[PDB]
Amino acid sequence: PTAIEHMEPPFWWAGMQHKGLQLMVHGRDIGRMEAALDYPGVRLVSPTRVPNANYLFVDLEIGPEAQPGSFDIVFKGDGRSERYRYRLLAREQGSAQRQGFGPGDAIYQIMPDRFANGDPSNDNVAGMREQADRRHGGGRHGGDIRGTIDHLDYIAGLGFTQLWPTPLVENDAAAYSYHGYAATDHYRIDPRYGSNEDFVRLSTEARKRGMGLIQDVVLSHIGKHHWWMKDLPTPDWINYGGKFVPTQHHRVAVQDPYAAQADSENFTKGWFVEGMPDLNQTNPLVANYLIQNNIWWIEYAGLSGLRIDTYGYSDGAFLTEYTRRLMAEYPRLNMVGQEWSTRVPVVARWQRGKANFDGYTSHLPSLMDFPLVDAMRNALSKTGEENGLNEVYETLSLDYLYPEPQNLVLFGGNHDMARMFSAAGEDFDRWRMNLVFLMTMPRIPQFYSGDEILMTSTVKGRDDASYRRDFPGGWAGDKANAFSGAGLTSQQRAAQDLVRKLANWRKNQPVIHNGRLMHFGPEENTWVYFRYNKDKRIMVAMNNNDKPMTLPTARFQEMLKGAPSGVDFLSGKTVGLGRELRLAPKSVVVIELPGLP
Amino acid sequence: PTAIEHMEPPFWWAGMQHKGLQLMVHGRDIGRMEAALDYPGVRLVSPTRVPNANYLFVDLEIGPEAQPGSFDIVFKGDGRSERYRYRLLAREQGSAQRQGFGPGDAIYQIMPDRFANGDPSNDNVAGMREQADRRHGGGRHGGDIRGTIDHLDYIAGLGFTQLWPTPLVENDAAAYSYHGYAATDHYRIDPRYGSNEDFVRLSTEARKRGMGLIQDVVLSHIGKHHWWMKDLPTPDWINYGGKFVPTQHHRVAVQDPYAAQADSENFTKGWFVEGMPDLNQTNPLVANYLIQNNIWWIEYAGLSGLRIDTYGYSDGAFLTEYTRRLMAEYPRLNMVGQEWSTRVPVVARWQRGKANFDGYTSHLPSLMDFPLVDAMRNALSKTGEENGLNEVYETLSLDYLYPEPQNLVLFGGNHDMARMFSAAGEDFDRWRMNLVFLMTMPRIPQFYSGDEILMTSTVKGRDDASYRRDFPGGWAGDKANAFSGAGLTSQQRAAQDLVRKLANWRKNQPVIHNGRLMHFGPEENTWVYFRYNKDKRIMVAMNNNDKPMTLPTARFQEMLKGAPSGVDFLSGKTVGLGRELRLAPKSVVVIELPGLP
Numbered sequence A, B: 001p002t003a004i005e006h007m008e009p010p011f012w013w014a015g016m017q018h019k020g021l022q023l024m025v026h027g028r029d030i031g032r033m034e035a036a037l038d039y040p041g042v043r044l045v046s047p048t049r050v051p052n053a054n055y056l057f058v059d060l061e062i063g064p065e066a067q068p069g070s071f072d073i074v075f076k077g078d079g080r081s082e083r084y085r086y087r088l089l090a091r092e093q094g095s096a097q098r099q100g101f102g103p104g105d106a107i108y109q110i111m112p113d114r115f116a117n118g119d120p121s122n123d124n125v126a127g128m129r130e131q132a133d134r135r136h137g138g139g140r141h142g143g144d145i146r147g148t149i150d151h152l153d154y155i156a157g158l159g160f161t162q163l164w165p166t167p168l169v170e171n172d173a174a175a176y177s178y179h180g181y182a183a184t185d186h187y188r189i190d191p192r193y194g195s196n197e198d199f200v201r202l203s204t205e206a207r208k209r210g211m212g213l214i215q216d217v218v219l220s221h222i223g224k225h226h227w228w229m230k231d232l233p234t235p236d237w238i239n240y241g242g243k244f245v246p247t248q249h250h251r252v253a254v255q256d257p258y259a260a261q262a263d264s265e266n267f268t269k270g271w272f273v274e275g276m277p278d279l280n281q282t283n284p285l286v287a288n289y290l291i292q293n294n295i296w297w298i299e300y301a302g303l304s305g306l307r308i309d310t311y312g313y314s315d316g317a318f319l320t321e322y323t324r325r326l327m328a329e330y331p332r333l334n335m336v337g338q339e340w341s342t343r344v345p346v347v348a349r350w351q352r353g354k355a356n357f358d359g360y361t362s363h364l365p366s367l368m369d370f371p372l373v374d375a376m377r378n379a380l381s382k383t384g385e386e387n388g389l390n391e392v393y394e395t396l397s398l399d400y401l402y403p404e405p406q407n408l409v410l411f412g413g414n415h416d417m418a419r420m421f422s423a424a425g426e427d428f429d430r431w432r433m434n435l436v437f438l439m440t441m442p443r444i445p446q447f448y449s450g451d452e453i454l455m456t457s458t459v460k461g462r463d464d465a466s467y468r469r470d471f472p473g474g475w476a477g478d479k480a481n482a483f484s485g486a487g488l489t490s491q492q493r494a495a496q497d498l499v500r501k502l503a504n505w506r507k508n509q510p511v512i513h514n515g516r517l518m519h520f521g522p523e524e525n526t527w528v529y530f531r532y533n534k535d536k537r538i539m540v541a542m543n544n545n546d547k548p549m550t551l552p553t554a555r556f557q558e559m560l561k562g563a564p565s566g567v568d569f570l571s572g573k574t575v576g577l578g579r580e581l582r583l584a585p586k587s588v589v590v591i592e593l594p595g596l597p
């Protein structure tokens, strides 16, 4: 091995909140060496060695007096010497105060390999382990940063204000590299997507179009082809000494009064799958590495927040420190954790400000609202139930378990579950109810690329490939192009028009962003709720039945206060409310009304 | 009415905690009367009239210096005088400190009409509105107090330490009188069961056998044939002016940040059914009436606690005061409320000690554990799921939501749900798992009469009559008799023997009453947990599969600590624990081990 092979992070910033910076340096016999530097405001702490001669950890304290600039770090030993030009960048104006995504935003989610192939020439990159195959469901299809940038106007035009791509960091695996969740280099965009600079450009171009960029980060695991696995930095860098020991996924074990330590350890240290080595975040070097790397991406790429994969599969004490560190840098940031449970208590445990039975504390601002999504999908698919919507109402009534339910991400779907339209039984009328719900709940809405044209999938069990079909129009030669509208069926186009209509309308509705919610218990699968404040009321009413239903309006008078009627935003029609609300089969109305005093 | 028709309560006690006593007096023109008395320690307050000339409410303050004895209350007006000799009883030594049922107890539940007909001559009582019909699923079959008393030896012999009969108070309805839930006289045992004195004797006879008596009380509603309904004490005594307005059962509306007042009012004021007028507990006279009546039954009948029907259908502020009053009189009492929801948060809201988001305070010690019973019934029924027991494990993990989860009542079944054996798919091995679970969880176990001989029912929906078939042996001429054993199948007798074996064993296992619980995440429908303290470990392992399973014991070493083997209490077989635990298809074992250091 030659010179200094990795220096991580490769550069930093003057004026960060946390003064400490730990460089992880990798090169042959770099551990046999002594570091030295001379730069005002930067102090070199003094070595703490690791037994592996191929790694050196350099501890710096960057005082508030340190100015932007650069300086040499010199490594000496064995009659030889190595050097690295270390740069402290100036921070952009307003960096620390950056506004994270919130209730006024709507997030559009893509998988970068499956969205748009702007450059077929990077589909394969010389030296990498996997060849592209657009005909393989688990293969690389060739989507890239160029293709994403090419279609930012489309995304912004649909009414979305944030872009969340699944991970773009290098995944140099022989198979299943496309999905991004098995990182082989946390400091490098996969060259098949483009360069680090292209990713920064993605953020800058999105910002020009009024959109933030949310990065998808994995903290718990890496891919087995990560360069670390060739020469473990420490014997405990990877859980179970770098050997495959599977997790059995007992997620409640970390937050259960009756838990066995075996089960909690198995949850946070167990390997997700054989190809995903599990990081030992109880090693402070590993903790520092991940904290610094994610801060590096936020600062370097101008991100508006993060989506955090496999949330509770990371060590709990590490998560407490990681969330504390990130939010201390960026107090207005948002980060949405993926805690995949349909149990409200299990999700709520992780949100900042929660008083937990075991004293567990967290600075995590947001989580994915799997419970409420599951409830609505059940309601809209189990159409033989008399009152399926009751599950949605009851789930929502548990919002008091969350410190900030308004800051949770509610979603139409994502890359891990059945397509939204398929989950609704390919029933367009019921699908409309899901879309209206998504855009009107007291949540941050997230929508999955392709759902706006009713892409379908299998519904039973688990079939990842089926959820991740290429976006129509993202590849040269596509017969249908959803970006231009060419070749869409009337129903596909109607779906896309409705998404554009609702999302753009939502951007302009403070009452949805921060108004109150009052809902009514569903009766015979009809449901009425209101978003309200002194300036506006929005009344949503859905009839989840293949028959007309009539609802006496006396029931809703604390919200209606004698309103004789209002205009339905969907149809433009005036709807009577004086004595009864008459709903057509399988209908939903979004009635706009004056304020509530 | 002849003079004074009703005086309620009809007598009271010297030396109660609350000094106030409010008498509700009923008779023609009694409202036109003025009350007077002279007895040391007893003060008559200032009259507060109601517009109904047939009722008078008399407020007394019984000072601690009032001795047991009697005094005339004289009612004078319009040139006449009426008298009532009022008695203050001496309280039994230790009355206030009576020990309520708790974790060391096991409750046997009966419906008095359906258990044992000790006296066929009271099946019909002259004057009453319903004739007995043993062949009608919703008719009176003739079970009575004599019958219950006859078989206390049997119930105690099974290992039960508490008897909970569904209500015995008068239900003089034209149809469906048998179930007890529609009271027509809160101060009188239905004459078809026996007299008030017979009910006291049931308590005293149960106590001689080491059993407490738990009364089933309805607070929210009465029956349409209650004598009040002929001449409403006040215009607002009954919600909605004494006219039927149905509840739609929006139970979460009383505990939901997004609730409509329409819904919360509809839950607490709405009539359960047309036949069940709803008590207006916001009227202080109604609140006082119910509180005093339930205290009267406890003090008079020597009860060990209460089971409180339709818990959240009563006014919330009333419930705070009711539970405060009861627990103030009897600080060690237990009362178990029926909040019929499978959602842990909805049930936990009501338990004494809970910190609620809305500041709601309750003094209710216990609730029915519908969530956990539902979880286990799902595990046992969902035979085509790889790991159904996971529901039970995750539900239990939520016990931190309850201030005192060990005080909750866990049940095999009851009069409102499918028979325990039917819920197990009539699979004796799965039934054994449910029984072991019931008897080893950190809960107060309750068992439904008839389940000890594997009585069966329909499985789907609500089918009350199916769950309430006559106890075999309760009627002269029965050809299957569970009391004697005559006509039971080998399997039915084995079930009965197992109930006896486990319930008597449980009585003498303090580790089950107050020990810790450590459970392990179920894997492939196998589940292992331990009850433990410094004195004992009890290991439960179950294999909910029709194939053998082999579980490496390394997993459980934090509890096993090298134990090489143990004896299964159930089969009496030795069970190896050294390296692997071999479980036969559909097996459950219960292994006692010495306490951990």
Ligand SMILES: OC[C@H]1O[C@@H]2O[C@H]3[C@H](O)[C@@H](O)[C@@H](O[C@H]4[C@H](O)[C@@H](O)[C@@H](O[C@H]5[C@H](O)[C@@H](O)[C@@H](O[C@H]6[C@H](O)[C@@H](O)[C@@H](O[C@H]7[C@H](O)[C@@H](O)[C@@H](O[C@H]8[C@H](O)[C@@H](O)[C@@H](O[C@H]1[C@H](O)[C@H]2O)O[C@@H]8CO)O[C@@H]7CO)O[C@@H]6CO)O[C@@H]5CO)O[C@@H]4CO)O[C@@H]3CO
Residues within 6 Å of the ligand: A179, A181, A218, A249, A272, A273, A309, A310, A311, A338, A339, A340, A341, A415, A416, A461, A462, A463, A464
């Ligand atoms: O970064 C990894 C991974 O993380 C994110 O999502 C995960 C989440 O954090 C986990 O909590 C969990 O969440 C739920 C899951 O989505 C639900 O499906 C279900 O999980 C169980 C299923 O009910 C059940 O089917 C069970 O049984 C097996 C599957 O049936 C079987 O197909 C196979 O699964 C393998 C996949 O088929 C295969 O494609 C491959 O998956 C990879 C993904 O394609 C890739 O995107 C990434 O996944 C991310 C995910 O995108 C994040 O958002 O890596 C995956 C791993 O290589 O490998 C699968 C094996 O894991 O085998 C399973 C045996 O388990 O599966 C699970 C029980 O484990 O409920 C869960 C919570 O209730 O998983 C998700 C998704 O991985």
Ligand SMILES: OC[C@H]1O[C@@H]2O[C@H]3[C@H](O)[C@@H](O)[C@@H](O[C@H]4[C@H](O)[C@@H](O)[C@@H](O[C@H]5[C@H](O)[C@@H](O)[C@@H](O[C@H]6[C@H](O)[C@@H](O)[C@@H](O[C@H]7[C@H](O)[C@@H](O)[C@@H](O[C@H]8[C@H](O)[C@@H](O)[C@@H](O[C@H]1[C@H](O)[C@H]2O)O[C@@H]8CO)O[C@@H]7CO)O[C@@H]6CO)O[C@@H]5CO)O[C@@H]4CO)O[C@@H]3CO
Residues within 6 Å of the ligand: B138, B176, B179, B181, B218, B249, B272, B273, B275, B276, B309, B310, B311, B338, B340, B415, B416, B461, B462, B464, B465
């Ligand atoms: O004191 C009253 C009652 O209280 C206790 O249990 C109740 C609990 O507290 C409530 O929260 C609620 O719980 C849910 C219930 O378990 C679910 O089953 C469901 O209820 C719906 C039914 O599923 C649905 O079928 C329909 O019900 C109709 C019946 O199908 C129909 O036959 C008829 O019902 C008559 C009964 O057949 C008949 O036996 C008699 O019922 C009386 C009970 O036998 C008697 O024990 C008592 O019930 C107690 C219960 O034992 C307590 O432990 O009073 C009953 C009379 O009220 O008479 C019935 C007619 O009067 O009619 C009904 C429609 O009225 O609709 C229901 C409700 O929508 O959801 C409930 C809420 O989530 O109820 C239980 C009682 O089941």
Ligand SMILES: [Ca+2]
Residues within 6 Å of the ligand: A117, A118, A119, A120, A121, A122, A123, A142, A143, A144, A192
């Ligand atoms: Ca490409």
Ligand SMILES: [Ca+2]
Residues within 6 Å of the ligand: A220, A221, A267, A268, A269, A270, A278, A279, A313, A314, A315
């Ligand atoms: Ca992990």
Ligand SMILES: [Ca+2]
Residues within 6 Å of the ligand: B117, B118, B119, B120, B121, B122, B123, B142, B143, B144, B192
């Ligand atoms: Ca009788």
Ligand SMILES: [Ca+2]
Residues within 6 Å of the ligand: B220, B221, B267, B268, B269, B270, B278, B279, B313, B314, B315
């Ligand atoms: Ca009521």
